[PDB]
Amino acid sequence: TVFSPDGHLLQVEHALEAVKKGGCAVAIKSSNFAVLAVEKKNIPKLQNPKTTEKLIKLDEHNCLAFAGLNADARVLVNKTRLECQRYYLNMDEPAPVDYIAKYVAKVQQKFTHRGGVRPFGIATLIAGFEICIYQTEPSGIYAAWKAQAIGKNAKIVQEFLEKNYQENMEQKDCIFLALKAINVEVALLTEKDLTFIEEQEINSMVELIDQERTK
Amino acid sequence: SFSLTTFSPTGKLVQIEYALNRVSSSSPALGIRAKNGVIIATEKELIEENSIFKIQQISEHIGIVYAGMPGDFRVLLKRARKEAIRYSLQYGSEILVKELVKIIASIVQEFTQTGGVRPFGLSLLICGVDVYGYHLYQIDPSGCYFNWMATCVGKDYQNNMSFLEKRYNKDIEIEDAIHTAILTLKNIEIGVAYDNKPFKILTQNEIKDYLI
Amino acid sequence: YDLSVSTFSPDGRLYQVEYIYKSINNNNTALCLECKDGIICCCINSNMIKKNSYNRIYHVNNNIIITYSGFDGDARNIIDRARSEANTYYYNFHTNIPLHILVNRISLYIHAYTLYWHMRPFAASIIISSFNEKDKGDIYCIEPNGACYKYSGIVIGKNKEMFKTEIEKKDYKDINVRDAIEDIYKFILLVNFSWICKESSYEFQNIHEEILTPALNKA
Amino acid sequence: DTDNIIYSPEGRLYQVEYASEAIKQGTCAVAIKSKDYVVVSGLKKCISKLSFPQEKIFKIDDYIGISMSGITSDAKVLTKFMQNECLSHKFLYNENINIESLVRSVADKYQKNTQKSSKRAFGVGLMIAAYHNEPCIFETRPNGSYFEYDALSFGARSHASKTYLEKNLHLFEECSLEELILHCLKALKNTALAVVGKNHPWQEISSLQLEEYLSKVKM
Amino acid sequence: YDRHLTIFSPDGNLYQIEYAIKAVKNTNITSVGVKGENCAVIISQKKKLLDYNNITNIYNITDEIGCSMVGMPGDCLSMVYKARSEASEFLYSNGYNVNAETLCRNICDKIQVYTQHAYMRLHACSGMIIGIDENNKPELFKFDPSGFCAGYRACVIGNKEQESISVLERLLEKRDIRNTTILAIEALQTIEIEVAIVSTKNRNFTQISEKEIDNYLTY
Amino acid sequence: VNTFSPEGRLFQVEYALGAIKLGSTAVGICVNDGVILASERRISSTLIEKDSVEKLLSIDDHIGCAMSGLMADARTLIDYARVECNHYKFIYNENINIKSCVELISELALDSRPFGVALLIGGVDKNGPCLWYTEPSGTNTRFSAASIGSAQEGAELLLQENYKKDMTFEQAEILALTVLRQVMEDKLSTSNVEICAIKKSDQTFYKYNTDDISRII
Amino acid sequence: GCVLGMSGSNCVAIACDLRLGANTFTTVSTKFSKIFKMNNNVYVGLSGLATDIQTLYEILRYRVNLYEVRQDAEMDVECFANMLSSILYSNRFSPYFVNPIVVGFKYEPYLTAYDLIGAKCETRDFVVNGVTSEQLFGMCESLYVKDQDENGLFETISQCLLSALDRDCISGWGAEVLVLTPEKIIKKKLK
Amino acid sequence: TTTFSPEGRLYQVEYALEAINNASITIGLITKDGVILGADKYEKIYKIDKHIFCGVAGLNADANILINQSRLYAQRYLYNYNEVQPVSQLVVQICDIKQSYTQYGGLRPYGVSFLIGGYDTKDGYQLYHTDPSGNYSGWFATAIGTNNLTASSVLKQEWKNDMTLEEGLLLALKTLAKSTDTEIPKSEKIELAYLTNKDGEVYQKYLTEKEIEELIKLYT
Amino acid sequence: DTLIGLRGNNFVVLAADTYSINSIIKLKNDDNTKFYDIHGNKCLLLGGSIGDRLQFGEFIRKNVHLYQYQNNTDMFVKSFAFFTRKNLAYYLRRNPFEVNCLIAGYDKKDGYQLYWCDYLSNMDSVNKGAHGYGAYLVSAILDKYYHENLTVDEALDIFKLCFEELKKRFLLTQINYELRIMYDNKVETQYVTV
């Protein structure tokens, strides 16, 4: 849109807020593994109501999570899919998370820049491979992180996450910190392969965090 | 461009509601749907009015009346006819009346949504014939085409909307339906798709044929 | 209401068109006279910086003449439009354009911009004229937003109405063969007199400076 | 109100008028015309102790050079356009561009920007200084108007230079280039100066020889 | 706001259309077009150094067809040029000259599209149209800035309208070229002038002779 | 957008100035033996991957360009500048002279929304290092020594305090490290700076290894 | 390409070869099936080049389903057939060849045969586009009786096939004969 | 079209949503046989394909366009893959349109919120709902239109994963009827329909509908 | 240059040649990967020119991997064949690629599937098929020794037949033939196959 006398952009600063009020998500990182975990609320009766919240797989060796508008997220993500396929076609080799973070950032920016288009309402974060995570704000900036949290009240999750942070850890145990920061949308990027973690599998852990907080 | 209409806080589109008010503020026409035919009529000094009828032939079968802005009727009628022709070129047969009503409804839709244009100012009646049966569809400015056994469109039709039912009582024959139309409507025009597919406007002499 | 070139006023006036009449009303006078033996458009531009030259009059062919008043830029551009028009017509029809059709062409050109909501109308009225023995002299004045009209001589620009008392002596103005100029130089009480007469060989020409001397030295 | 797509009730356009309220911030530049030579000085404003000040002067063609004084971006765009146009000219006709054809063209571009609503008027006004045969100085107001000149000064406190112009004939001492340039440095009073005429085309004596020439106003 | 643009009222009734009709109704150039028995007259008042010899509202758009026009003049010359374009495209496509109403489909639709489309201003002009039909009956139509193919045995346009409908009625009770043209020239007298019949050659549309203006006016 | 203010300044572009004040600081100093290029690296959050975010970039092999203001608009202008100033060398070996790379970027920067960023492009092309600040306004200018970011508000004086043309690029490194360490809250370390250089000889763009800056301090 | 369409008193029958051989008539395939069902009362039998066959039946699948859903009535054969003629004519090049046959009740039987440009013959009786067409019109012109029971009409159309297939090298194995009645459909394989 | 709210919301879409909540109620149910979808209406339920049908709410006049588009998409997918479109993709298509309109355009967003349900074999019987916003979620039961929560929460308080069509439809009707009135819907306008595998065979004048009209004999 | 594919209830098996002749006169370039595994359970055996089958094969690879990364379900192999059908045929007769292809795959409903296609976009479902000039040779064997119910390995003996046949009496083609072997779980190559 247009600069205010301060030089801050309004549509962007407004645009962030939809993320500043949306379902939380986080990623925890390490060598060959990373735990991406979000949170989405749904009506209990309807088990199928959000098979869509689930963390997206842009490529077999790539994975994404987001917070903000879903209606806009489906768009951005599809553009990302078409683009990883484009790079993977023109190179015959897979897209590195760097280049795709760069592409997506170029998009979100572009809409903020060129006229005729409403700015995005979402904040993205991406895991890929060693393994390294890139968060992308609505402004069009992006940044590497060791750990981060998008969503409503991201600061409590994240600054409490700083209190608990530790770098490389276990394939399973690194999961627990995501919960300690964070029903749950768990997925694990590992072996350059995103995976939809079994529902029952975490249930044991789902018990302890429920009770270590109690006892 | 810019859709000049946009939504209300109350959720309504106010502009199309305005056009509804103009049609309500504009001239009457009737439609009545006999078991074996359909009749549409309307209340239509230097002016040679013989060239001017709200009635119009879209095909050998289909005929229409608008209530609102006459030039708006002109352009809608033009696109409509060009669609009956575009269809009859696309396929080997005459258009079903319901299909033409649907295409007119989409054409009316776009301007109500598409940027930079004032929404159409008029209602429509579309009597017709098809292998299914003798038809009568009114089209709303909103794009809300609707089936009718009978209808009204123009000024002071609130009280007048409720005279039409009586032909269905025991007057489903065309010749008796005629009285239902004119007496409900109590210049004038009448087009009737009868047991034969072709329709034709009754002359003022034949208007005196039923005036007695 | 006054904010659009296009939107009508509640009283049907087009204020935005109406302002071009103000522009032209303040801008430099540019009389064009007609003799009964020719036509003489003239200008009195009122714009060390150069004083030597700033011609307002220009032609579309060696015979037809233009003159204007108002914003310099828009009118110069319309002169370009007329050159391209006369030359287009010469490419199609292997003859020079009648003055009449050119005049209507510029009427349409100037008229077009008024209809467009973003587009800004030109701010310059335009005299266009020609004279031949057979093609009798005529002076079409074009007010912006169309309505070009033929004239026996019209003054345009800032002070034209106070000159019209002089031009209204158009019996005496038609009386002249080559001395209408000398009358004008006192009448008006940078400048660009010209020629389209039999002595002109009907071709347009800047009036000669040593022919300009008799006028100025006449009084 | 508030767009150049509409005239004021006065009959004025405000947006284009704002362009001079842009140009007054710009630093003064001055030009002198000897009968066979033209000399154009600028004034390179220095934003910091460590900045090297920008050059107002350019060099569009062999004998053509210019001195824009308004917002820099429009100025550079006009330069790239005028250069591309002169080169298109020569590339077409194996011939140097007419100076006045160029001025008429660039001025056409100004008007094309100041008429259309979506495109803003330029905040700059060129002071072209050249000749295809006999020396000239053109000025382009940020509109379609352009005027030839004998001597021109413009930008910031150009007012001193303007009032001073009356004190000398543009060619009160044309015959020597040193007389000319000393008139130039008087009229204006690192700072720039440039020379074009007769045998040597455009030239920028910004050498330390110019630094020597600087004392000559006080020598 | 709804008034500033071609859009519906809260009452559901269009504004700017009424304003364009005020443009026509304050144009103050009244014109009476009456059909004659096997003929048809179209008259208008022809309203300084200005030439009455130039002025007219009546205009032919083919040999058989002539359309008096009233309203904003630039729009009139434009709608006429559009009309001529229209008949030329129909003839070119189909080999028949347009029936007057067939020219009114083009006139009235082209004049209509302005009404929905908010940008380009609604048409400011209106007038009759006359021509022999393929049916031997002469055809006299009209149009309004709001779309209208109309239809009449008689009509009036301009500052006067339905004021003169009741006045026209008196001729309507008495409604050959003598008999019909007198109705027209009187209808100007009833409430120089320029008269135009299709029935000179019964199919060709020509304005009646200047010498023969007076004889009806004096009979 | 381009609605000229009565004051005569362009509205929009003058509103867009403030965006660079949001900028974290950087100090480019052209010197007789190269161009030094320092910036804040303390911009980092504790948990972003350490020193994994560069303000300073590289338009071409022998150009390096610290950025002000919005990180995004800068990423774009660097993208197109990389493209163009590469495309210049499409068959002929010479890389674009710095003045003209920067002239491209500005001449585009003139004409959506005006960019919120300012650049500090440097490089060696002519026998001598170049230092070009590009204002968001499209005005383009060659400093001998200059700084960007809001800290450049008062830090600029410090250049005026010390800038002599005659310095070993190492001396210049001390100087720019002086002026930029002054404006930082953290005592400067390699996490507080992301310095880069283009030598008068090597002419190659090179971000310093952290060991180096840790060594000089 | 080999296709037939006999008509009957209360029936229509359609048939084909099932070979889709390639260049030099090597039989690359024997299960190819040109006949298709656009509707319970509407069928098309394509022939000529097979690429253009799948592309064409594919486009019909599209536009007919589209029309049937867009307009509730199952499409009448005159519509599908005139539209078909409209389809081919847009470009000769699209089918380097194709010779559609259209068949079905409308409950008067309707048998029509397009040319590849969309030239069309709305026949009252049999019509036989196909590479072996001359043998087809040859046998069927004389073998044909006006109206028959579906089985005698079946053996009839089968004798036109059994006759033609043994004279042409390009004629297929099998026969996807398809007698039908408004309420029933009887496909068979004959050897 | 309009920009984000200062709080962080969209005006236009909130307006169109305001419009679709005022529409007459449509409802949806899944059982073993196939989705059954109710109505307060004139068909107000349209088929996309054979295997797919959608039941709309909102300014339906603009829904007419999404029915036409929908059908173009499904037939286009069949055109491209020789396989009739899975429901989920079709919903992705329509919501791709809706998001195309809410973001860039200058056109007003569609006033339509509609259900869609159908049997891709791959995923069993499907049910979905859409918003002008472009958000879609799967469902087992829904009650869009007026009294969205009021008609939902009855099922939510009285529902199970599997029923017979013959028993389930009545349970659609307990909400659907008691909300308006106990008998009114089958006294007046009404339109339930289902996909056994294909079409919505129940018809309001159909004798099967008498069972609907007979729910009351069961109800009282 | 010779391509071969054979379906049964226990298998799809795509045997194919590895040679790649720069010049038609000589097989200067060897061991080429004609196959394209486009699915968890669908390989694509292309042939003709190397550049056409490469551009087209990579192309179809992307449109399918895109389609699957998109919708949840994997592309059902007939949709894969027909999509390749539409793509290859999309070209105006002036432009189709010179590319013979054997789609082969597995299905959650329809199980093993095979689709023989041509330079012209001709295509059909079959129990066995071949491409190249060698189509004429192996096909009389493949027809002859075929069992509709055969275990996969005796089919592998049948490809041994076909191969030793093409060696003896054709553009001699001795080098080992790779061949993906479908299973309920996975494909199973044999580059060593001679």
Automatic annotation (TrEMBL), chain B:
GO terms for molecular function: endopeptidase activity. Its main location: cytoplasm. Coiled coil: none annotated. Residues 1-22 form the Proteasome alpha-type subunits domain. It is found in: Cytoplasm; Nucleus. GO terms for biological process: proteasome-mediated ubiquitin-dependent protein catabolic process; ubiquitin-dependent protein catabolic process. SMART domains: Proteasome_A_N. This is Proteasome subunit alpha type-2. It comes from Plasmodium falciparum (isolate 3D7). The lineage of its organism: Eukaryota, Sar, Alveolata, Apicomplexa, Aconoidasida.
UniProtKB/TrEMBL annotation, chain F:
GO terms for biological process: proteasome-mediated ubiquitin-dependent protein catabolic process; ubiquitin-dependent protein catabolic process. It is found in: Cytoplasm; Nucleus. GO terms for cellular component: cytoplasm; nucleus; proteasome core complex, alpha-subunit complex. One of its GO terms (molecular function) is endopeptidase activity. Residues 1-19 form the Proteasome alpha-type subunits domain. The keyword Metal-binding does not apply. CDD domains: proteasome_alpha_type_5. Belongs to the peptidase T1A family. The 26S proteasome consists of a 20S proteasome core and two 19S regulatory subunits. This is Proteasome subunit alpha type.
UniProtKB/TrEMBL annotation, chain G:
GO terms for molecular function: endopeptidase activity. One of its GO terms (cellular component) is proteasome core complex, beta-subunit complex. Keywords: Cytoplasm, Hydrolase, Nucleus, Proteasome. Gene3D superfamilies: Glutamine Phosphoribosylpyrophosphate, subunit 1, domain 1. InterPro entries: Ntn_hydrolases_N, Proteasome_beta_3, Proteasome_bsu_CS, Proteasome_sua/b, Proteasome_suB-type. Disulfide bonds join C140-C160. The keyword Nucleus applies. One of its GO terms (biological process) is proteasome-mediated ubiquitin-dependent protein catabolic process. It is found in: Cytoplasm; Nucleus. Component of the proteasome complex. Component of the proteasome, a multicatalytic proteinase complex which is characterized by its ability to cleave peptides with Arg, Phe, Tyr, Leu, and Glu adjacent to the leaving group at neutral or slightly basic pH. The proteasome has an ATP-dependent proteolytic activity. Belongs to the peptidase T1B family. This is Proteasome subunit beta. The lineage of its organism: Eukaryota, Sar, Alveolata, Apicomplexa, Aconoidasida.
Automatic annotation (TrEMBL), chain I:
Keywords: Cytoplasm, Hydrolase, Nucleus, Proteasome. GO terms for molecular function: endopeptidase activity. PROSITE patterns: PROTEASOME_BETA_1. It comes from the Eukaryota. GO terms for biological process: proteasome-mediated ubiquitin-dependent protein catabolic process; ubiquitin-dependent protein catabolic process. Its main location: cytoplasm. It is found in: Cytoplasm; Nucleus. Gene3D superfamilies: Glutamine Phosphoribosylpyrophosphate, subunit 1, domain 1. The keyword Isomerase does not apply. It holds the Pfam family Proteasome. One of its GO terms (cellular component) is proteasome core complex. SUPFAM superfamilies: N-terminal nucleophile aminohydrolases (Ntn hydrolases). Component of the proteasome complex. Belongs to the peptidase T1B family. PANTHER family: PROTEASOME SUBUNIT ALPHA/BETA. Component of the proteasome, a multicatalytic proteinase complex which is characterized by its ability to cleave peptides with Arg, Phe, Tyr, Leu, and Glu adjacent to the leaving group at neutral or slightly basic pH. The proteasome has an ATP-dependent proteolytic activity. This is Proteasome subunit beta. The lineage of its organism: Eukaryota, Sar, Alveolata, Apicomplexa, Aconoidasida.
